[PDB]
Amino acid sequence: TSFTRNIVGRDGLCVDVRNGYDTDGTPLQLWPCGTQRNQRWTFDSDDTIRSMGKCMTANGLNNGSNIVIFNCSTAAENAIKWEVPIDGSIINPSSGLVMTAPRAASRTILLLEDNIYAASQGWTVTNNVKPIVASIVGYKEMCLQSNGENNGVWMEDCEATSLQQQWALYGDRTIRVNSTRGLCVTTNGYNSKDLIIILKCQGLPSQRWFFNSDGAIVNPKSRLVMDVRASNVSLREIIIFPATGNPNQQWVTQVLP
Ligand SMILES: *[C@@H]1O[C@H](CO)[C@@H](O[C@@H]2O[C@H](CO)[C@@H](O)[C@H](O)[C@H]2NC(C)=O)[C@H](O[C@@H]2O[C@@H](C)[C@@H](O)[C@@H](O)[C@@H]2O)[C@H]1NC(C)=O
Ligand SMILES: *[C@@H]1O[C@H](CO)[C@@H](O[C@@H]2O[C@H](CO)[C@@H](O)[C@H](O)[C@H]2NC(C)=O)[C@H](O[C@@H]2O[C@@H](C)[C@@H](O)[C@@H](O)[C@@H]2O)[C@H]1NC(C)=O
Ligand SMILES: *[C@@H]1O[C@H](CO)[C@@H](O[C@@H]2O[C@H](CO)[C@@H](O)[C@H](O)[C@H]2NC(C)=O)[C@H](O)[C@H]1NC(C)=O
Ligand SMILES: *[C@@H]1O[C@H](CO)[C@@H](O)[C@H](O)[C@H]1NC(C)=O
Ligand SMILES: CO[C@H]1O[C@H](CO)[C@H](O)[C@H](O)[C@H]1O
Ligand SMILES: CO[C@H]1O[C@H](CO)[C@H](O)[C@H](O)[C@H]1O
């Protein structure tokens, strides 16, 4: 009933108890991923998340409150209970606030903030601390492809050698250009028919994505899903659109060698 993993988030860095110190109150931060004990988090049935025998704890339950390690039996019960929604948030149920990395840099301190479904609020509980590299196959068994910064993504015939068909699926729930990992698949707005492009990763809600059980790729803020516009691949436009279950909204990842 307990199991232990790393927690990967913004820019692929991991949740780390600062300096590897275990004294009560030590803040959680981002740090490059590794096997050190202060990056190993044990998820217990009681909804606690523990490292070095102590609990992930809200040091306060307000917008901007720090998250720290603290003795599990002395901390407040409301402050040590967490849930892990399927869209990759880490939420403190009492406050409704979510774990947020406000900057990408190593040593950024993790805070509880209002949920805006930002990529800075996406996390992946996993033992694989490297991004998973895959082609994204969709409508007509075509592949989603990059075409440079500030340019639309679109469908092309899948080719094992096309580097612009290769995507790094990061722990912060961003979908990145594998060969240029500072660039993220981004919706150019939150309205139906807004275009999906590549832009510099900035931790925004427009850059957060979820692969759901219906084969959809969902943008949690807008609720809308990637869609090959009008089921017409020669338009070379992928948009966000309400989920219909239709073939032009169905996707699957295929891991690359
Ligand atoms: C919760 O904390 C967030 C981080 O401090 C607030 O967002 C930040 O607000 C700053 C102004 O106080 C602003 O300069 C920052 O750009 C912004 N950061 C980001 C990335 O959102 C947030 O404030 C709300 O949202 C911002 C964008 C403004 O519209 C504010 O007027 C809002 O109050 C805080 N949320 C709440 C509800 O207090
Ligand atoms: C969390 O705080 C608890 C209460 O202060 C610690 O338990 C206490 O540890 C004292 C010093 O080690 C010990 O003499 C006390 O009898 C005990 N108090 C209670 C109410 O159990 C606890 O330490 C852990 O649990 C105790 C019982 C021993 O097994 C320690 O060696 C454990 O570390 C604190 N937990 C942690 C992880 O620090
Ligand atoms: C995706 O991009 C990554 C990062 O550039 C590539 O990984 C590098 O691969 C080279 C050659 O195998 C190694 O020297 C490095 O160790 C890798 N870097 C990292 C950070 O992992 C990768 O080859 C690309 N393509 C695929 C399919 O993964
Ligand atoms: C698909 O888009 C192309 C290119 O814009 C257009 O010429 C073509 O007629 C479209 N096909 C349909 C069925 O609309
Ligand atoms: C020098 O490494 C130590 O400090 C850094 C930075 O604080 C991290 O906490 C890391 O996990 C810990 O081993
Ligand atoms: C009439 O709907 C068709 O076009 C819209 C865009 O106009 C969406 O792409 C939708 O999924 C597709 O079925």
XYZ file of C-alpha atoms and ligand atoms in Angstrom:
401
model
C 0.000 0.000 0.000
C 2.979 2.338 -0.357
C 5.292 2.836 -3.351
C 8.151 5.253 -4.054
C 8.940 7.387 -7.100
C 10.531 10.669 -8.240
C 8.212 13.616 -9.045
C 9.215 15.363 -12.309
C 7.916 18.886 -13.170
C 8.874 22.158 -14.809
C 11.574 21.817 -17.518
C 12.099 18.165 -16.473
C 13.603 19.034 -13.075
C 12.478 17.056 -9.979
C 10.878 17.892 -6.611
C 13.806 17.933 -4.145
C 14.060 18.665 -0.418
C 16.491 21.612 -0.383
C 20.171 20.702 0.419
C 18.986 17.169 1.313
C 18.325 18.506 4.845
C 15.520 16.792 6.809
C 14.905 19.355 9.509
C 11.226 20.382 9.893
C 10.360 23.262 7.600
C 12.969 22.596 4.918
C 11.466 23.930 1.601
C 10.887 21.836 -1.530
C 12.584 23.093 -4.701
C 13.367 22.072 -8.276
C 16.713 20.327 -8.854
C 18.040 18.136 -11.690
C 16.674 14.600 -11.239
C 18.649 11.882 -9.451
C 18.407 8.923 -7.087
C 19.196 10.875 -3.846
C 16.794 10.149 -0.975
C 15.542 13.739 -0.809
C 14.097 13.169 -4.374
C 12.436 9.812 -3.482
C 8.778 10.311 -2.538
C 6.719 7.516 -0.964
C 2.924 7.673 -1.617
C 1.034 6.094 1.283
C -2.614 5.058 1.442
C -3.307 7.862 3.987
C -2.711 10.423 1.158
C 0.656 11.569 2.531
C 3.742 11.918 0.285
C 6.931 11.299 2.264
C 10.659 11.767 1.841
C 13.361 10.914 4.350
C 10.594 9.695 6.667
C 8.834 13.069 6.831
C 5.773 14.525 5.050
C 5.290 16.932 2.160
C 3.518 19.729 4.085
C 1.725 23.000 3.244
C 3.439 25.618 5.491
C 0.242 27.536 5.387
C -2.790 27.119 3.168
C -2.922 30.542 1.258
C -1.996 31.695 -2.354
C 1.815 31.726 -2.299
C 2.293 29.472 0.776
C 5.500 27.420 0.844
C 5.578 23.621 0.668
C 8.132 22.017 3.042
C 9.060 18.724 4.679
C 7.707 18.277 8.220
C 7.295 15.516 10.817
C 4.130 13.586 9.776
C 2.689 13.127 13.272
C 3.159 16.724 14.431
C 2.074 18.594 11.274
C -1.579 19.566 10.865
C -3.620 16.803 9.146
C -5.003 19.304 6.531
C -1.438 20.283 5.640
C -0.110 16.768 4.861
C -2.882 15.300 2.657
C -2.396 15.491 -1.127
C -4.109 14.107 -4.234
C -2.733 13.446 -7.712
C -5.370 14.233 -10.367
C -5.090 12.429 -13.677
C -4.226 15.738 -15.466
C -0.930 15.905 -13.521
C -1.735 18.464 -10.808
C -0.651 17.888 -7.191
C -3.391 19.372 -5.059
C -3.802 19.997 -1.335
C -7.491 19.103 -0.876
C -8.060 21.310 2.189
C -7.075 24.569 0.448
C -7.714 23.547 -3.162
C -4.350 25.132 -4.067
C -1.874 23.251 -6.260
C 1.899 22.688 -6.326
C 3.522 25.365 -8.577
C 7.102 25.975 -9.821
C 7.035 29.802 -10.372
C 10.375 29.857 -12.310
C 12.182 27.146 -14.377
C 15.590 27.574 -12.678
C 17.200 25.010 -10.419
C 16.619 26.041 -6.768
C 13.200 27.551 -7.505
C 11.077 27.062 -4.370
C 7.785 25.276 -4.763
C 4.585 27.096 -3.663
C 0.880 26.429 -3.324
C -1.007 28.728 -5.680
C -4.417 29.135 -7.237
C -4.946 26.496 -9.941
C -4.746 28.068 -13.416
C -3.883 24.747 -15.130
C -0.423 26.154 -15.969
C 2.433 23.954 -17.226
C 4.253 25.309 -14.113
C 1.603 23.278 -12.162
C 2.040 19.970 -14.140
C 3.921 17.013 -12.515
C 4.597 13.316 -13.290
C 5.063 10.671 -10.602
C 7.530 8.220 -12.124
C 10.855 6.354 -11.806
C 11.894 7.350 -15.359
C 13.415 10.805 -14.878
C 14.036 11.396 -18.632
C 11.343 12.755 -21.014
C 9.707 9.996 -23.070
C 10.495 10.465 -26.792
C 7.719 9.459 -29.188
C 5.922 10.137 -32.459
C 2.330 11.310 -32.069
C 0.210 9.469 -34.615
C -3.256 10.767 -35.481
C -5.784 11.182 -38.216
C -5.206 8.911 -41.290
C -2.281 7.314 -39.389
C -0.310 10.503 -40.100
C 2.241 12.012 -37.657
C 2.076 15.349 -35.897
C 5.063 17.445 -36.981
C 6.843 20.572 -35.888
C 7.790 23.338 -38.374
C 9.868 25.722 -36.268
C 9.281 28.348 -33.552
C 6.216 30.569 -34.094
C 4.922 28.196 -36.796
C 1.892 25.880 -36.855
C 2.196 22.173 -36.209
C 0.577 19.900 -38.843
C 0.180 16.302 -40.098
C 2.616 14.548 -42.394
C 3.277 10.919 -43.477
C 5.174 9.261 -40.589
C 8.901 8.836 -41.229
C 11.258 7.169 -38.732
C 13.967 9.755 -39.799
C 11.927 12.955 -39.463
C 13.322 14.685 -36.409
C 10.466 17.244 -36.504
C 8.061 14.312 -35.859
C 9.883 13.478 -32.630
C 8.341 14.789 -29.375
C 9.717 14.872 -25.856
C 6.905 14.317 -23.425
C 8.087 16.225 -20.352
C 7.068 15.629 -16.710
C 5.461 19.084 -16.483
C 2.872 17.898 -19.078
C 4.444 19.912 -21.913
C 4.973 18.405 -25.365
C 8.353 19.601 -26.606
C 10.337 19.595 -29.860
C 12.762 16.730 -29.139
C 15.702 18.340 -30.911
C 14.987 21.830 -29.445
C 13.705 21.226 -25.925
C 13.163 24.905 -25.038
C 10.156 24.881 -27.496
C 6.633 23.717 -26.566
C 3.430 22.872 -28.421
C 1.220 25.876 -27.558
C -2.381 26.824 -28.251
C -2.603 30.439 -29.552
C -5.567 31.154 -27.271
C -8.227 29.250 -25.329
C -11.110 29.526 -27.763
C -12.486 26.966 -30.188
C -10.503 26.972 -33.507
C -7.464 28.714 -32.050
C -4.345 27.413 -33.818
C -1.716 25.117 -32.226
C 1.835 26.388 -32.847
C 5.326 26.025 -31.409
C 6.489 28.726 -28.976
C 9.216 29.111 -26.338
C 8.281 27.142 -23.200
C 7.057 29.722 -20.618
C 5.152 27.522 -18.103
C 1.744 28.815 -19.466
C -1.721 27.151 -19.390
C -1.582 27.247 -23.224
C 1.403 24.799 -23.062
C -0.144 22.145 -20.771
C -1.591 18.930 -22.273
C -3.131 15.705 -20.971
C -3.436 12.314 -22.848
C -6.847 11.051 -21.788
C -8.430 7.586 -21.997
C -10.437 8.421 -25.197
C -7.297 8.947 -27.381
C -7.704 12.772 -27.006
C -4.940 15.301 -26.258
C -6.627 17.744 -23.913
C -5.670 21.353 -22.936
C -6.992 21.432 -19.336
C -7.590 25.264 -19.088
C -9.704 25.516 -22.235
C -11.125 21.932 -21.903
C -10.603 21.671 -25.651
C -8.633 18.988 -27.493
C -6.175 18.859 -30.460
C -8.108 18.517 -33.727
C -7.033 18.173 -37.366
C -9.101 21.094 -38.725
C -12.099 19.941 -40.805
C -10.553 16.481 -41.102
C -8.494 18.075 -43.867
C -4.779 17.349 -43.612
C -3.930 19.614 -46.589
C -5.103 22.670 -44.628
C -2.017 22.101 -42.414
C -3.866 23.435 -39.395
C -4.278 21.754 -36.052
C -6.660 23.599 -33.733
C -8.190 23.154 -30.289
C -11.851 22.154 -30.461
C -14.461 20.608 -28.222
C -14.051 16.781 -27.854
C -16.214 14.831 -30.391
C -14.559 11.377 -30.342
C -14.131 11.629 -34.161
C -11.063 10.211 -36.007
C -9.561 13.732 -36.487
C -9.223 14.019 -32.697
C -7.743 10.546 -32.013
C -4.028 10.228 -31.178
C -1.603 7.673 -29.849
C 2.047 7.909 -28.802
C 4.524 5.575 -30.474
C 7.844 5.368 -28.653
C 10.908 5.934 -30.799
C 14.086 3.846 -30.840
C -1.794 34.095 -6.694
O -0.403 34.365 -6.807
C 0.030 34.546 -8.140
C 1.547 34.688 -8.065
O 1.830 35.789 -7.198
C -0.628 35.809 -8.736
O -0.247 35.963 -10.081
C 0.669 37.053 -10.270
O 0.103 38.307 -9.935
C 1.024 39.380 -10.016
C 0.363 40.666 -9.528
O 0.067 40.628 -8.136
C 1.467 39.523 -11.473
O 2.362 40.603 -11.623
C 2.098 38.218 -11.970
O 2.378 38.270 -13.353
C 1.156 37.048 -11.724
N 1.824 35.810 -12.101
C 1.254 34.898 -12.903
C 2.207 34.044 -13.707
O 0.024 34.726 -13.005
C -2.141 35.718 -8.682
O -2.691 36.996 -9.065
C -3.828 36.931 -10.015
O -3.529 36.791 -11.410
C -2.650 37.777 -11.949
C -2.187 37.431 -13.358
C -3.343 39.130 -11.926
O -4.465 39.109 -12.797
C -3.775 39.407 -10.487
O -4.554 40.581 -10.363
C -4.582 38.255 -9.895
O -4.819 38.611 -8.555
C -2.606 35.290 -7.272
N -4.011 34.929 -7.293
C -4.934 35.511 -6.521
C -6.362 35.144 -6.818
O -4.712 36.325 -5.627
C 8.051 13.106 14.799
O 7.842 13.721 16.059
C 7.589 12.731 17.050
C 7.135 13.407 18.335
O 8.071 14.397 18.693
C 8.828 11.867 17.242
O 8.528 10.823 18.177
C 9.284 11.037 19.386
O 10.676 10.842 19.210
C 11.380 11.100 20.412
C 12.855 11.356 20.106
O 13.280 10.345 19.226
C 11.064 9.892 21.304
O 11.896 9.805 22.444
C 9.597 10.028 21.712
O 9.217 8.931 22.515
C 8.695 10.130 20.468
N 7.388 10.674 20.772
C 6.295 10.065 20.303
C 4.971 10.686 20.648
O 6.331 9.023 19.632
C 9.183 11.216 15.910
O 10.364 10.422 15.990
C 10.121 9.139 15.357
O 9.279 8.304 16.139
C 9.798 8.022 17.446
C 8.749 7.323 18.299
C 11.123 7.260 17.351
O 10.943 6.027 16.680
C 12.068 8.132 16.535
O 13.336 7.526 16.446
C 11.448 8.420 15.151
O 12.297 9.226 14.363
C 9.322 12.281 14.816
N 9.504 11.631 13.528
C 10.588 11.813 12.767
C 10.712 11.023 11.501
O 11.474 12.607 13.073
C 15.892 13.345 -28.722
O 16.753 14.357 -28.205
C 17.680 13.891 -27.212
C 18.336 15.071 -26.526
O 19.073 15.710 -27.537
C 18.658 12.950 -27.883
O 19.476 12.409 -26.819
C 20.910 12.479 -26.899
O 21.352 11.389 -27.653
C 22.752 11.403 -27.839
C 23.118 10.294 -28.829
O 22.487 9.099 -28.404
C 23.453 11.164 -26.503
O 24.822 11.450 -26.694
C 22.888 12.003 -25.351
O 23.138 11.344 -24.111
C 21.378 12.271 -25.456
N 21.011 13.381 -24.580
C 20.089 13.345 -23.600
C 19.999 14.565 -22.740
O 19.302 12.412 -23.352
C 17.856 11.882 -28.676
O 18.750 11.181 -29.504
C 16.742 12.420 -29.587
N 15.977 11.397 -30.339
C 15.311 10.415 -29.704
C 14.480 9.480 -30.533
O 15.351 10.260 -28.479
C -8.883 20.611 -47.933
O -8.085 21.780 -47.903
C -7.560 22.128 -49.197
C -6.414 23.127 -49.096
O -6.884 24.350 -48.549
C -8.720 22.556 -50.118
O -8.285 23.017 -51.388
C -9.572 21.304 -50.268
O -10.642 21.536 -51.145
C -10.058 20.851 -48.895
N -10.848 19.656 -49.048
C -12.140 19.755 -48.715
C -12.980 18.511 -48.775
O -12.647 20.828 -48.354
C 24.574 19.444 -3.668
O 23.389 18.629 -3.804
C 22.574 18.758 -2.654
O 21.964 20.076 -2.683
C 21.173 20.359 -3.856
C 20.792 21.834 -3.898
O 20.091 22.291 -2.746
C 20.009 19.361 -3.849
O 19.169 19.505 -2.674
C 20.586 17.929 -3.881
O 19.536 16.969 -3.911
C 21.516 17.647 -2.689
O 22.086 16.351 -2.867
C -17.560 20.437 -38.871
O -16.551 20.017 -37.912
C -15.305 19.852 -38.578
O -14.549 21.072 -38.662
C -14.251 21.659 -37.365
C -13.513 22.966 -37.609
O -14.342 23.844 -38.381
C -13.482 20.704 -36.453
O -12.211 20.505 -37.120
C -14.282 19.413 -36.343
O -13.631 18.421 -35.541
C -14.524 18.856 -37.739
O -15.315 17.676 -37.550
